[PDB]
Amino acid sequence: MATKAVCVLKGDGPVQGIINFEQKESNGPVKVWGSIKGLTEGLHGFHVHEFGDNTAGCTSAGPHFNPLSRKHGGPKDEERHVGDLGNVTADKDGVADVSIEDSVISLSGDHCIIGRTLVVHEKADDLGKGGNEESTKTGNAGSRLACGVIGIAQ
Amino acid sequence: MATKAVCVLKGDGPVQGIINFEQKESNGPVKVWGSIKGLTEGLHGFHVHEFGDNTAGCTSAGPHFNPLSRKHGGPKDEERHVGDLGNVTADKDGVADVSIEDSVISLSGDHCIIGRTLVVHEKADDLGKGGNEESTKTGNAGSRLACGVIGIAQ
Ligand SMILES: [Zn+2]
Ligand SMILES: [Zn+2]
């Protein structure tokens, strides 16, 4: 049934925002767009984590959503986690106007991201090209600044 | 797919809690439990609403999850919304130790509640036996005290 999803991001600091998802055909890409504020200028890792579990804050969301058991990558890679959406970019006012299109995540089926956690991270995602253990796990993107559970939308 | 879900309830007031969901068999019943605190002693409407959308707080969840287009009821009714879990009871210390078993909600398929909103209400749900139009729509449970998106749990 689901063609639209939405996510409210909050954390302990000032980072907050709203992200929209739209998938018109189940065999088609998902459009991801919206605004996150309170960010430092530059790149921030932007990931779908495995669990829609916020009991302990962002930490409860678990690792990247990774049902094919691959190593971390960027959204252009064949070797990637399902939840690898690469970076978003905050302007000099702390605002990331997100606009992404991705055909690996979905609003149904196995790769479905509904009821999982969208997280925006402290630092840039190195897209799995960093050369340490951590690169292949989380792309060295550091802290979880804000997260939310991805919800069915009207 | 999912055998566990979790929901963190938050609102503008003091109401807050964690509800777990467990469904070992896709075609078996769902267990609902955990605690909500900060409630007034007495009955509170406990419903799954249609949208997991929190962009305007609890209001943006919309009406009760009703995929079969029926009228509000108690969970033991045949004429009920999928989202009709009835009431929870807060004790004299303001705690609802929720414990509910339901055969209509599901963690998979088309009644799937993952990615929708769990709401705890201001007043008792009259189970649709209240005589007004409100009763057959919302059970007169009143305003939304706390909600959260139901997420995939580990
Ligand atoms: Zn990853
Ligand atoms: Zn109802």
XYZ file of C-alpha atoms and ligand atoms in Angstrom:
310
model
C 0.000 0.000 0.000
C 2.646 2.771 1.101
C 3.803 5.442 -1.417
C 4.796 8.226 1.085
C 6.712 8.204 4.264
C 7.952 10.846 6.639
C 10.505 11.191 9.447
C 10.957 13.668 12.270
C 14.553 13.982 13.403
C 15.444 14.987 16.988
C 18.361 14.446 19.265
C 20.012 15.810 22.429
C 21.407 18.830 20.714
C 19.893 21.346 18.373
C 19.783 19.179 15.283
C 16.280 18.740 14.007
C 14.271 18.356 10.794
C 11.661 16.734 8.650
C 12.369 14.261 5.852
C 9.934 13.072 3.192
C 9.944 9.908 1.188
C 8.018 9.204 -1.989
C 7.849 6.088 -4.081
C 5.270 6.153 -6.829
C 5.892 2.644 -8.140
C 7.095 -0.234 -5.997
C 9.744 -1.047 -8.632
C 10.946 2.582 -8.776
C 13.157 4.912 -6.961
C 12.419 6.650 -3.703
C 12.570 10.446 -3.555
C 14.009 11.789 -0.335
C 13.757 15.473 0.497
C 13.399 17.998 3.286
C 15.265 20.272 5.712
C 17.581 19.645 8.650
C 18.714 22.590 10.773
C 21.098 23.119 13.596
C 23.898 21.458 11.662
C 27.513 22.505 11.277
C 28.579 23.537 7.743
C 29.645 20.659 5.453
C 29.057 17.019 4.976
C 27.052 14.770 7.289
C 26.465 11.089 6.985
C 22.811 10.305 6.323
C 21.833 6.706 7.058
C 18.921 4.345 7.542
C 19.753 2.233 10.565
C 18.324 -1.179 11.218
C 15.849 -0.633 14.156
C 13.051 1.839 14.764
C 14.088 1.640 18.377
C 14.455 4.841 20.188
C 14.421 3.617 23.795
C 17.983 4.700 24.462
C 18.029 7.581 22.051
C 19.803 7.202 18.623
C 22.108 4.468 19.917
C 19.156 1.941 19.952
C 18.666 2.185 16.187
C 21.499 -0.290 15.731
C 23.870 -0.494 12.775
C 23.131 0.549 9.202
C 20.220 -1.222 7.601
C 22.131 -4.021 5.900
C 19.963 -7.000 4.961
C 22.339 -8.163 2.214
C 25.328 -8.200 4.603
C 27.584 -6.009 2.504
C 30.277 -3.591 3.454
C 29.540 0.109 3.812
C 29.607 2.261 0.641
C 28.097 5.305 -0.934
C 24.711 5.322 -2.623
C 26.331 4.885 -6.076
C 28.074 1.685 -5.134
C 27.020 -1.878 -5.775
C 28.866 -2.809 -2.544
C 26.715 -0.839 -0.006
C 24.332 -1.204 2.811
C 20.654 -0.716 1.916
C 20.670 2.203 4.346
C 23.633 3.991 2.714
C 22.394 7.311 1.543
C 25.803 9.003 1.532
C 26.102 12.561 2.664
C 23.948 15.618 3.059
C 25.415 19.080 2.979
C 24.703 21.849 5.458
C 25.063 25.443 4.257
C 26.655 28.297 6.366
C 23.347 28.739 8.206
C 23.302 25.129 9.443
C 20.692 24.013 6.983
C 20.764 20.894 4.877
C 18.142 21.065 2.126
C 18.158 17.357 1.379
C 17.290 16.117 -2.116
C 18.255 12.478 -2.901
C 16.978 9.779 -5.179
C 17.755 6.206 -4.456
C 16.525 2.889 -5.919
C 18.004 0.527 -3.340
C 15.889 1.590 -0.307
C 12.169 1.070 -0.668
C 8.838 1.727 0.897
C 7.872 -2.010 0.671
C 9.399 -5.439 0.353
C 12.710 -6.573 1.820
C 14.442 -3.279 1.441
C 11.611 -1.521 3.098
C 12.692 1.349 5.378
C 9.332 1.975 6.990
C 9.585 1.582 10.764
C 13.427 1.891 10.709
C 15.528 4.869 11.783
C 16.860 7.709 9.715
C 20.004 9.175 11.361
C 22.046 12.255 10.565
C 25.642 11.993 11.690
C 28.292 14.284 13.146
C 30.982 14.077 10.342
C 31.214 13.196 6.700
C 30.681 9.659 5.513
C 33.840 8.531 3.690
C 31.629 6.346 1.482
C 33.618 3.260 2.558
C 36.820 4.460 0.999
C 38.712 5.262 4.177
C 40.989 2.179 4.481
C 40.235 1.327 8.125
C 37.853 -1.197 9.777
C 35.472 1.605 10.640
C 35.141 2.871 7.059
C 33.621 -0.485 5.999
C 31.144 -0.316 8.889
C 29.904 3.266 9.273
C 32.155 5.234 6.880
C 33.696 7.091 9.834
C 30.664 9.392 10.158
C 30.816 9.584 13.964
C 28.037 10.540 16.332
C 24.354 10.270 15.855
C 23.089 13.899 16.056
C 19.325 13.422 15.413
C 17.188 10.482 14.402
C 13.624 9.461 13.936
C 11.509 6.503 13.132
C 10.442 6.413 9.421
C 6.609 6.576 9.381
C 3.783 5.914 6.864
C 2.538 9.228 5.503
C -0.564 10.530 3.859
C 9.409 -10.305 8.293
C 9.093 -8.556 11.771
C 8.661 -10.376 15.102
C 9.273 -7.424 17.517
C 8.335 -3.819 17.396
C 8.749 -0.970 19.950
C 7.221 2.438 20.473
C 8.561 5.376 22.506
C 5.654 7.619 23.563
C 6.302 11.292 24.088
C 4.043 14.301 24.302
C 3.799 17.983 25.374
C 2.888 17.036 28.945
C 4.459 14.521 31.397
C 3.104 11.303 29.726
C 5.839 9.044 28.523
C 6.530 5.408 27.971
C 7.841 2.410 26.159
C 5.580 -0.192 24.574
C 6.866 -3.453 23.135
C 5.145 -5.636 20.570
C 5.840 -9.300 20.012
C 4.472 -11.679 17.396
C 6.250 -15.022 17.115
C 3.910 -16.303 14.361
C 2.926 -14.140 11.480
C -0.599 -15.503 11.743
C -0.611 -15.533 15.537
C -1.572 -12.805 18.016
C 0.448 -9.764 18.921
C 1.594 -9.220 22.594
C 1.584 -5.555 23.714
C 3.246 -4.557 26.919
C 5.231 -2.078 28.873
C 4.683 1.015 30.845
C 3.453 4.464 30.467
C 3.859 6.984 33.228
C 2.648 10.478 34.035
C -0.987 9.587 33.444
C -4.072 10.498 35.579
C -5.509 7.442 37.497
C -8.115 5.673 35.406
C -8.904 4.656 31.866
C -7.090 5.935 28.751
C -7.810 5.250 25.103
C -4.968 3.279 23.513
C -5.065 3.306 19.710
C -2.988 2.786 16.684
C -3.589 5.746 14.356
C -3.165 5.652 10.554
C -0.021 7.780 9.860
C 3.388 7.629 11.454
C 3.641 11.349 10.962
C 4.656 13.530 13.832
C 5.377 16.770 11.934
C 2.656 18.534 13.851
C 2.884 16.408 17.043
C 0.244 13.737 17.689
C -2.412 15.493 15.481
C -0.708 14.519 12.274
C -1.165 10.780 12.960
C -4.750 11.187 11.650
C -7.673 8.924 12.541
C -7.632 5.420 13.921
C -5.936 2.808 11.691
C -8.917 1.510 9.825
C -7.911 -0.396 6.727
C -11.403 -2.233 6.510
C -13.556 0.889 6.745
C -15.528 -0.095 9.847
C -16.746 1.702 12.972
C -14.937 2.189 16.216
C -15.301 -0.710 18.686
C -13.635 -2.430 21.674
C -10.887 -4.893 20.852
C -13.290 -7.840 21.666
C -15.755 -6.610 19.046
C -16.134 -7.747 15.539
C -17.092 -4.262 14.375
C -13.781 -2.446 15.237
C -10.945 -0.546 13.576
C -7.714 -2.650 13.249
C -6.296 0.124 15.471
C -8.750 -0.508 18.397
C -6.817 -1.654 21.349
C -9.392 -0.212 23.866
C -8.118 1.189 27.141
C -5.183 1.061 29.376
C -5.521 1.725 33.120
C -3.213 4.049 35.017
C -2.858 3.175 38.697
C -2.915 5.687 41.629
C 0.754 6.519 41.101
C -0.074 7.450 37.457
C 1.429 4.270 35.868
C -0.278 2.048 33.190
C 1.468 -1.297 33.181
C 0.207 -2.277 29.810
C -0.509 -5.898 29.033
C -2.681 -6.665 25.968
C -3.016 -9.531 23.532
C -4.581 -8.817 20.184
C -5.446 -10.892 17.084
C -6.362 -8.157 14.684
C -3.250 -6.022 14.669
C -0.207 -7.504 12.978
C 3.544 -6.847 12.657
C 3.409 -7.913 8.892
C 1.036 -8.001 5.951
C -1.794 -5.570 5.337
C -2.872 -4.909 8.914
C 0.655 -4.234 9.627
C 1.083 -1.582 12.273
C 4.820 -1.020 11.772
C 5.333 2.632 10.880
C 1.998 3.826 12.184
C 1.401 5.811 15.433
C 0.555 4.465 18.846
C -1.515 7.114 20.832
C -2.461 7.138 24.486
C -5.540 9.322 25.073
C -6.882 11.761 27.669
C -10.055 9.834 28.647
C -11.626 6.420 28.509
C -12.486 4.885 25.256
C -16.260 4.182 25.441
C -15.782 1.298 22.927
C -18.285 2.881 20.505
C -21.181 2.530 23.016
C -21.560 6.263 23.789
C -24.524 7.293 21.659
C -22.908 10.310 19.844
C -21.170 10.311 16.327
C -17.837 10.775 18.096
C -18.238 7.373 19.676
C -18.285 5.446 16.455
C -15.154 7.356 15.214
C -12.972 7.827 18.340
C -14.832 6.309 21.325
C -14.721 9.838 22.943
C -11.194 9.137 24.219
C -10.364 12.821 23.754
C -7.096 14.589 23.109
C -3.749 12.782 22.381
C -1.385 12.841 25.345
C 1.591 11.041 23.908
C 2.477 9.163 20.762
C 5.230 7.522 18.800
C 5.917 5.719 15.603
C 5.817 1.908 15.951
C 9.306 0.680 14.868
C 11.042 -2.565 14.019
C 12.767 -3.921 17.165
C 15.676 -6.335 17.666
Zn 26.555 1.778 5.795
Zn -11.187 3.156 16.559
